[PDB]
Structure formats: structure tokens, C-alpha cells
Design a protein around this ligand. Sequence first.
Ligand SMILES: CN1c2ccccc2[C@]23C[C@H]4[C@H]([C@@H]5C[C@H](O)N4[C@@H](C5)[C@H]12)[C@H]3O
Lengths: 121, 5
Amino acid sequence: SLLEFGKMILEETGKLAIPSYSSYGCYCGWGGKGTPKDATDRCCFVHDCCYGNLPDCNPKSDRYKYKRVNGAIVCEKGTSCENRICECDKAAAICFRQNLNTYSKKYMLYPDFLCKGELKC
Amino acid sequence: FLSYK
Ligand SMILES: CN1c2ccccc2[C@]23C[C@H]4[C@H]([C@@H]5C[C@H](O)N4[C@@H](C5)[C@H]12)[C@H]3O
């Protein structure tokens, strides 16, 4: 669920999911359209795609359990959906950590009309 | 707590 995803992001980047990643670029947050503006936006695009592979799951509300082995994120055994949701979130959190250096405040609250194009997962 | 990404 978004409860775990947000704690994961904060632990990983130090930034709060809302509003640092709730309305970033063209894919971080609501909606999905256009060309990812940058690496961080690509992380969200891939994350969106990851959820896309789990049609009969509910990523925003299904809660899962995860632990940290030393710094590593370790998803715990849960239902099939919970396992896959956790793996999708884990990857985005790491992807976010890996691209902090290029995080740009000019992409927060990015207007919709500037998200031009299509991109298949 | 604090996400809707
Ligand atoms: C169909 N699929 C797509 C097909 C073509 C382009 C974009 C998308 C998705 C991926 C991702 C996201 C929402 C939430 C879900 O994780 N996925 C769905 C809807 C869309 C949305 O952006």
C-alpha cells in the first residue's frame, strides 16, 4: 500500500513522498502520459509499468511487510500480490536513491500539457 | 503516511 511505499522512499532518499514525488514530472504521482522528463521520472514510469503487470492486485491499498537487512530492502512472504507489489516498490525506492543527484525542483507540480507523447511499457 | 506516488 501507499503506506509502505512512502516509508520506503523516506528511508531511502530522506525526502517525503508527498510532495517530493506525488507530483513530479509526467509519471510521478497521478496519471501517466508523455515522455519521462528525467531519470527520476523514468523511475516512476517503470514503477507505473510494474504495477501494470499486476492487473488483479491493488497496489495502493494492499499492505505488505518488508524488513531491512542492514541497508537492504527485503520483502517478506505474504500473498502473491503482496510479494510482487513489494518488489515493484523496492525497485522504485532504489531507483530514486540512485538518481537523487539529478532530482530537479523545476519538475515538481509539472503542468499536464507539457507531457507530450506515448511510450509503451 | 505521506505517499500517493
Ligand atoms: C495500462 N498501463 C499503461 C499503458 C501504456 C502507458 C502507460 C500505462 C500505465 C502504466 C501504469 C500507470 C497506471 C497505473 C498502473 O500501474 N499502470 C496502468 C495505469 C497503465 C499508467 O501510466
